[PDB]
Paper text:
The arginine deiminase pathway (ADI) is the most widespread anaerobic route for arginine degradation in microorganisms and performs the conversion of arginine to ornithine, ammonia, and CO2, generating one mole of ATP per mole of arginine consumed. The ADI pathway is composed by three catalytic enzymes: arginine deiminase (ADI, EC 3.5.3.6), ornithine carbamoyltransferase (OTC, EC 2.1.3.3) and carbamate kinase (CK, EC 2.7.2.2). Here we have described the structure of the three enzymes that constitute the gene cluster in the ADI pathway in Mycoplasma penetrans (together with the specific membrane-associated arginine permease coded by arcD gene) and compared them to previous structures of the enzymes. In this regard, M. penetrans possesses and expresses the complete set of the ADI pathway genes at the same time while exhibiting a fermentative metabolism.
Carbamate kinase (CK) generates ATP from carbamoyl phosphate and ADP, and this constitutes the last step in the fermentative catabolism of arginine, agmatine and allantoin/oxalurate. Crystals of M.penetrans CK display a unit cell composed of one molecule in the asymmetric unit. Based on results obtained by gel-filtration chromatography, by predictions of the PISA server and by previous structures of CK from other organisms, the biological unit can be considered to be a dimer.,, the structure can be divided in two domains, with a large crevice in the middle that creates the binding sites for the two substrates, carbamoyl phosphate (CP) and ADP. The N-terminal domain (residues Met1 to Ala222), rich in α-helices, is composed by two sets of four stranded β-sheets, the first sheet constituted by four parallel strands from the central β-sheet and the second sheet smaller and formed by mixed β-strands. This domain contains three long α-helices, α1, α2 and α3, which make up the entire dimer interface, and the mobile PSD domain (“protruding subdomain”, from Lys126 to Val159), which is involved in the catalytic reaction by an overall “rigid body” movement upon substrate binding. The structure here of CK from M.penetrans differs from the previous structures by the presence of two sulfate ions, one in the carbamoyl phosphate pocket and another in the β-phosphate ADP binding pocket. The gap in the electron density maps corresponds to the flexible PSD domain (“Protruding SubDomain”), and only residues at both ends of the PSD domain and the internal loop from Ala143 to Val150 could be partially modeled in the electron density, all displaying high temperature B-factors and giving as a result a poor agreement between Rwork and the Rfree in the final refined structure. However, the putative coordination of the phosphate group of CP shown for the E.faecalis CK is not complete in M.penetrans, since the sidechain of Lys126 (Lys128 in the structure of the E.faecalis CK), which belongs to the mobile PSD domain, is not interacting with the sulfate ion.
Author numbering:
A (entry chain A), B (entry chain A): 3 to 133, 142 to 148, 157 to 309
Write the structure that this text describes.
């Protein structure tokens, strides 16, 4: 069993090329389904949700009375926009290998606690760089911690069947619970965290985080610069103490990788690149993370 | 077992109100899940997909270099935009009744044959009324016949469990098969047809088509004007011969209702309004259609 998370930057800038880019991950996903693995699939949406959200603003409101599309709704559109491209491609690749399996894309709502510190400190800048319907302009939005998901129960079961399931698109839509009632809110959820929570609920072995590096380095552009091959939480904690990692780029991926393997000798997390990910699953590339 | 299809006009004009409108259908859907029924849920997307597709055109391309969003991709966004609102609301309503069930939204790709006559006659007008990346401007787009769906196999199983499944959003994204390869194409699929094909594959009893009428009438604004209560394919065929029905508004719903009950004494199709749909399930309103 293997949960794979594909960054939003790997899906490109326009539909045109997103349709292109997505083939690569899909073919890789197909090949594992052959080696006998269960691949649960996920993806980020930084660029795609931004493109969609801008656009409703960008000019559409400018050049008319077009409606107000909060960020939640643009994440909804981002999921169906991306899920569409992935659903074809991975279905398509599986067929090249004459394999029979249902590829699914679940629209994803991610449960977060409403008292999350993150809201009280609106972190991630978003949308038009102007100086915009009433939010905390600076705009900006939080990054809540993912506690669960609307259909996990049913999702894990589809994974129990041999269904190749695509979930946690862009990390899912931030959803709080208020008086036994759901309420989508505006903001984002880090897709690595999201997919790591999912990786846990389905209880896979491996959690692979796809990213544009062969290894995560420490002391970069320094004499003691070193590439991590294997490693563990204990060390990552020190490395993190000394700010080894780009706050955002690598830190969240590291932390999310830790959250998954922590106290589970039977599971690893791999942070490798797209080209070299089959190698990566055999120590030959990327950085393995363990309890 | 009951498949319900909710028109796009019933979801409104803007997210603001779509979030409002969707509560009504959801509460109705909740109540059936209580009477012991399995409710498979579906919806159209005429207005929503248009709003999204315009917008990328409307001004966004005008007021910048924003990307080219074909209609397929705007249907992808329309599904995740709508699936989001439905997923909350119907989950929410089910909780008011303290019921425990997983509500799911499957991104939907609808298989059509590429030789479909419909393409060679681009029927349904779409997008900017100008006089637009190269399609058949007149623009316009076909309305293929739905032969199946990427995950029906897996979808019907989730329905076998007690999962309340939302599918065929906007009728699904038109997808042809070319050399064992899938290829989303531009155009639409009538959601009533789509949901009727689905109604069949899951093999429910009832297929309810929600629409803004208490009954389907014949000979409207004529002396012999009459409301249909029960009826059958044989008669509908004559009524259709004499153009009893609005080509588009009622015709497709009628035909789709026929396609489902035809040769199945154990199943009906109900064409009733939203306010009066629980009544409708008991002969008290709407028009029942039978083999």
């Amino acid at each position: 069993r293997i949960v794979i998370a594909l960054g939003g930057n790997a899906l490109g800038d326009n539909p045109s090329q997103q349709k292109e880019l997505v083939k690569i991950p899909a073919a890789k996903i197909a090949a594992l389904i052959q080696e006998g693995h269960e691949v649960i699939v996920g993806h980020g949406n930084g660029p795609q949700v931004g493109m969609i959200f801008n656009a409703f603003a960008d000019a559409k409101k400018a050049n008319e009375k077009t409606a107000l599309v909060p960020f939640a709704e643009a994440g909804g559109m981002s999921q169906g926009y991306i899920g569409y491209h992935m659903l074809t491609a991975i279905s398509n690749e599986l067929k090249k290998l004459n394999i029979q399996k249902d590829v699914l894309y679940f629209l994803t709502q991610t449960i977060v606690d409403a008292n999350d510190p993150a809201f009280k400190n609106p972190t991630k800048p978003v949308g038009p760089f102007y100086s915009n319907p009433n939010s905390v302009i600076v705009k900006v939005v939080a990054s809540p911690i993912p506690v669960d998901f609307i259909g996990i129960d049913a999702i894990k079961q589809n994974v129990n069947n041999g269904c190749v399931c695509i979930v946690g698109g862009g990390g899912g839509i931030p959803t709080i619970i208020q008086d036994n009632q759901y309420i989508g809110v505006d903001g984002v959820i880090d897709k690595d965290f999201a997919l790591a929570k999912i990786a846990d609920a389905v209880n896979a072995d491996i959690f692979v985080v796809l990213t544009a590096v062969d290894y995560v380095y420490v002391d970069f552009n320094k004499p003691t610069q070193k590439a991590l091959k294997t490693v563990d939480v204990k060390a990552l904690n020190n490395f993190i103490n000394q700010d080894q990692f780009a706050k955002g780029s690598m830190l969240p991926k590291i932390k999310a990788a830790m959250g998954f393997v922590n106290g589970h000798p039977n599971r690893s997390a791999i942070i490798a690149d797209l080209s070299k990910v089959e190698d990566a699953l055999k120590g030959l590339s990327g950085t393995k993370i363990i309890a």
